[PDB]
Design a protein around this ligand. Structure first.
Ligand SMILES: Nc1ncnc2c1ncn2[C@@H]1O[C@H](COP(=O)(O)O)[C@@H](O)[C@H]1O
Ligand SMILES: Nc1ncnc2c1ncn2[C@@H]1O[C@H](COP(=O)(O)O)[C@@H](O)[C@H]1O
Ligand SMILES: [Cl-]
Lengths: 284, 285
């Protein structure tokens, strides 16, 4: 059937109740719009795991550290929906912030996931991950999905939502979707557009440096701090200004431990206007 | 026959079956040691859905006093036998280690900042965060159509309504009037904390609250003087009053010219028990 596009909470609730009463398995893909092929893979994955796929498009002011970053987030609903219909989404939910947070941001009920919200990317962005856990919890309550897809691309977010779901008793399968890459190896990102032509040809070096490290760990290498000193310099060498790098436990994002079962390598490096980032999971 | 479930996976199996059967579900959250007040919630819930789930869980996250948690009464077998006669369909009685497997330090929480820090939340810092967290988790686990709560915990009820409105829960929140002993004392699991002697003094809280309400019915509106007198009377009979309030019944803010109903919110220690009570007062004349 034709994809539905719903902007209001009452119309949403009507449709969600209908699907729930019919016993349809619901998948949810949360987004903030401005969609590219990475996001389409999320929708393709969701479609294989449920009867109906709900895609949200909502630029979430509770997760913006600077209120002005909202004013400059691209709004491209028509083009987002062209892509989503072609990938078989059943419903696009695109609400106004006034309808989602009618009582304002400061006194809005929130969900906080301790420790995971305030380390790493959370350290520099007070309140960011509270905004993420809050909206996602709200979307879970509104749409009542059996399955929800998130990109491995924003790995801390994925880990954050997995913990919230485990702690808060949500019966929802959280699916982490592998990053979509150019034939280069470069991970697809909205922000790849602000690189120059010459910079776009250096960009692949982030993934390649990252994967050299993964293969050492597969062979047994464990001296973590030195692996990372290496990579900050391999990268300096070839034209990046590295942000700090990490190798952490895949579940908690804490430093690795004799008991860690899976690691994540977390890369972040500057090239002109864009901060590029990549990551890779290593089995232990 | 009433079911009893302890484990989260078994609970989810049963909630799925009921939904497959097209059942509407009501939820009544409790911390056990059930009394006639709890039974009235259950009876109300049974009028509102096909099946009623009653939860029994002494929630450590809502106890800001370690002495209170340690001594809170646990009477699970007695609780289940009363619920069987009031036709509860399922009692969910989980272990803390299952609800909070890694303990509380790193447990994801839900906070309702509109209501969690004022009034009873000021007197009990940390408490309401525990309430919203466990209630949110129960809502996610059970996905009820209806949930019933006691007017006894008046601010708790408004806090849960606010959480539901803000977080997109498709759950009808129903309030149930307070049930009292024959002598007027509001029933409560913490009444067991009273000595035999103190139990005979305890009804004075309601008496004093109702004396205040009668003065308001006669037109008195000097709120701080009314509350000072009630505190003096509580002291006189052997209570130690906590902070007392009189607020707009709908918003819980201070009364204004627009207010049509007030709520008197009482709290007072008697021996080891911190008793609370409340009363709505119709301001219209
Ligand atoms: N290249 C990619 N591959 C897979 N998922 C992605 C990719 N880029 C973004 N996502 C996911 O899309 C969602 C919204 O991300 P963003 O585009 O950064 O707002 C998140 O779940 C991301 O992790
Ligand atoms: N005396 C009472 N009358 C009506 N409801 C009550 C009474 N005492 C407790 N409740 C309600 O029973 C539920 C569980 O209370 P508690 O077990 O004290 O956590 C809450 O919704 C309370 O507000
Ligand atoms: Cl309590």
């Amino acid at each position: 059937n034709a994809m539905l596009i719903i902007e209001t909470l009452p119309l949403l609730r009507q449709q969600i109740r209908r699907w729930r009463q019919e016993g349809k398995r619901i998948a949810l893909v949360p987004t903030m719009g401005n969609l590219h092929e990475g996001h389409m893979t999320l929708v393709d994955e969701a479609k294989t795991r449920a009867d109906v796929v709900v895609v949200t498009i909502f630029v979430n002011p509770l997760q913006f550290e600077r209120p002005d970053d909202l004013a400059h987030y691209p709004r491209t609903l028509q083009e987002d929906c062209e892509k989503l219909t072609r990938h078989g989404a059943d419903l696009v939910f695109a609400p106004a912030a006034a309808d989602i947070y009618p009582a304002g941001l400061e006194k809005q009920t929130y969900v906080d996931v301790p420790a995971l919200s305030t380390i790493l990317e959370g350290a520099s962005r007070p309140g960011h991950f509270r905004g993420v856990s809050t909206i996602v919890s709200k979307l879970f309550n509104l749409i009542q999905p059996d399955v929800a897809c998130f990109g491995e691309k924003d790995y801390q977010q994925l880990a954050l939502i997995r913990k919230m779901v485990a702690d808060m008793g949500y019966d929802i399968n959280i699916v982490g979707v592998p990053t979509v890459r150019a034939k280069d190896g470069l991970a697809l990102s909205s922000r790849n557009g602000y690189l120059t032509e010459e910079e776009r040809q250096i960009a692949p070096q982030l993934s390649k440096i990252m994967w050299a490290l993964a293969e050492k760990m597969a062979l047994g290498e464990r001296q973590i701090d030195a692996l990372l000193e290496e990579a900050a310099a391999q990268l300096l060498r070839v034209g990046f200004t590295p942000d700090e790098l990490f190798i952490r436990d895949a579940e908690t994002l804490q430093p690795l431990t004799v008991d860690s079962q899976q690691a994540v390598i977390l890369m972040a490096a500057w090239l002109g206007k864009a901060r590029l980032i990549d990551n890779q999971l290593v089995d232990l």
